[PDB]
């Protein structure tokens, strides 16, 4: 997998919507609770993501949020290639809701439980103690010099 | 250190912008919030720390940074509490592309985009976005 490729998936919990962006090559994630899966919120999410990483391609679930012209215009402004219906990360959702379960009682609000879960996902040593965490792998893959 | 950040408040069009600058690179993140609260600050710092390896944050000395919710976030994340060069710069950029968007929010994240991806200097230059990942990739050795 190439360095510029992300998967976007929504997940739902307690009646709220979590947008998740998974860096394919590394397994790094970031995520936010938004009110609902609208064009505006998706567009805003993508734009934040693309301001921080060098995002070339997005694979989406082709939900109606991604087919809106708001998102299309966000992706064109950022020069992101949007690839609707293209699969690959579904485990990513079951994993994330799992970690959210483990921290949920340390937060007043779900949204804080989601970020704590992101943090924990991104810092976990994958494959023993000789390994690298998702946050380490992304910076390794993306680094140009 | 790969791990030192400065966090700053900025006010325009009546809303508040929270700006984090990675000191060694000039890389920024920013979130637009209704008010400068302990809740939003903590939340912002938690997003920040889930993404980058944040060790120390330098802050103005507002009460938003000293609530117990911020200290619990900073204790949980292992963060220690303690240039305007990339702050006047953010303001400048928001104003050059502001017309391109209705909501302040959206121009803020456009301006963060533009700032993080702008190559500094000629051929041989780097963007702030590249400097941060290079600095941290180097440090992971």
């Amino acid at each position: 997998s190439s360095p510029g490729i992300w998967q976007l998936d929504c997940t739902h919990l307690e009646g709220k919507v979590i947008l998740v962006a998974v860096h394919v090559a590394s397994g790094y994630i970031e995520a936010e609770v938004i009110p609902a899966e609208t064009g505006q919120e998706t567009a805003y999410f993508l734009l934040k993501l693309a301001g921080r990483w060098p995002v070339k391609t997005v694979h989406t679930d082709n939900g109606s949020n991604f087919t809106s012209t708001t998102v299309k215009a966000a992706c064109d402004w950022a020069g992101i290639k949007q690839e609707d219906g293209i699969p690959y990360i579904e485990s990513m959702n079951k994993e994330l809701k799992k970690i959210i379960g483990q921290v949920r009682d340390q937060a007043e609000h779900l949204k804080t439980a989601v970020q704590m879960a992101v943090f924990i996902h991104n810092h976990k040593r994958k494959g023993g103690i000789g390994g690298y965490s998702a946050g380490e792998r992304i910076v390794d893959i993306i680094a140009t010099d | 250190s790969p791990g030192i950040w400065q966090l700053d408040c900025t006010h325009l069009e009546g809303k508040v912008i929270l700006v984090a600058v990675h000191v060694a690179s000039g890389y920024i993140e920013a979130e637009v919030i209704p008010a400068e609260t302990g809740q939003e600050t903590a939340y912002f710092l938690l997003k920040l720390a889930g993404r980058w390896p944040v060790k120390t944050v330098h802050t103005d000395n507002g009460s938003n940074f000293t609530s117990t919710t911020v200290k619990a976030a900073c204790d949980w994340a292992g963060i220690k509490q303690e240039i305007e060069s990339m702050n006047k710069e953010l303001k400048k950029i928001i104003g050059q592309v502001r017309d391109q968007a209705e909501h302040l929010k959206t121009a803020v994240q456009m301006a963060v985009f533009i700032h993080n991806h702008k190559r500094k200097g000629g051929i041989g230059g780097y963007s702030a976005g590249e400097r941060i990942v290079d600095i941290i990739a180097t440090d992971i050795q």
Partner: peptide, 6 residues
């Protein structure tokens, strides 16, 4: 456009 067309 950029958040609400044009």
């Amino acid at each position: 456009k950029x958040d609400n067309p044009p």
